[PDB]
Amino acid sequence: GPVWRKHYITYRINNYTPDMNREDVDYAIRKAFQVWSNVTPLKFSKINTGMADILVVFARGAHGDDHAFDGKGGILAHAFGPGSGIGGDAHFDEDEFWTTHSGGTNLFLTAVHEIGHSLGLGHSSDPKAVMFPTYKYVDINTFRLSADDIRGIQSLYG
Numbered sequence: 001g002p003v004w005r006k007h008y009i010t011y012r013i014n015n016y017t018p019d020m021n022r023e024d025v026d027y028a029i030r031k032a033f034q035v036w037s038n039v040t041p042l043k044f045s046k047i048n049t050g051m052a053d054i055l056v057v058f059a060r061g062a063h064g065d066d067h068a069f070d071g072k073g074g075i076l077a078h079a080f081g082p083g084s085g086i087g088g089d090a091h092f093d094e095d096e097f098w099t100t101h102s103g104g105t106n107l108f109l110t111a112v113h114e115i116g117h118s119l120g121l122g123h124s125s126d127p128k129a130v131m132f133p134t135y136k137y138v139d140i141n142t143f144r145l146s147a148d149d150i151r152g153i154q155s156l157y158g
């Protein structure tokens, strides 16, 4: 599959869920990018204007691609693999309730999974891996990538 062929990667947050404080959205997304840059040569920077490599979008129902969201529950988010235009972009279902904690759906943990996809990773069959297809809350303050996630990303980068 596709990978980014450059080390400096930019992201832009298109719009903000009303479910969270603005600064908490920023920090959750920043922390999620850090998870991946910690184990690759990639460097991530938030830009406030213009075209980013990775556009972060909150939206509900039909929102202009082929991956219509389904209301509360089920699909929480989806992202496109590396590439031009929409490639890399990560979309979060506004019909979920986004949080900093174990309530609703944790934005940080979902963003880690989505960014994995934005970088070229597919799903893992290992239930311990963040790239496993099923959302499961784990304490975010002690979160660590599984060995499976590390081998996956390192197979693509570095």
Ligand SMILES: O=C(CNS(=O)(=O)CCc1ccccc1)NO
Pocket (backbone or CB within 6 Å): 074, 075, 076, 077, 078, 079, 109, 110, 113, 114, 117, 130, 131, 132, 133, 134, 135, 136
């Ligand atoms: O895989 C999907 C679609 N299904 S799921 O949304 O519900 C993925 C949610 C998820 C999975 C694992 C960890 C964190 C969030 N999107 O990337």
Ligand SMILES: [Ca+2]
Pocket (backbone or CB within 6 Å): 069, 070, 071, 072, 073, 074, 075, 076, 093, 095, 096
């Ligand atoms: Ca949903």
Ligand SMILES: [Ca+2]
Pocket (backbone or CB within 6 Å): 052, 053, 054, 055, 083, 084, 085, 086, 087, 088, 089
């Ligand atoms: Ca893009």
Ligand SMILES: [Ca+2]
Pocket (backbone or CB within 6 Å): 017, 018, 019, 093, 094, 095, 096, 097, 098
């Ligand atoms: Ca919401």
Ligand SMILES: [Zn+2]
Pocket (backbone or CB within 6 Å): 063, 065, 067, 068, 078, 091
């Ligand atoms: Zn979408």
Ligand SMILES: [Zn+2]
Pocket (backbone or CB within 6 Å): 113, 117, 123, 133
């Ligand atoms: Zn996924």
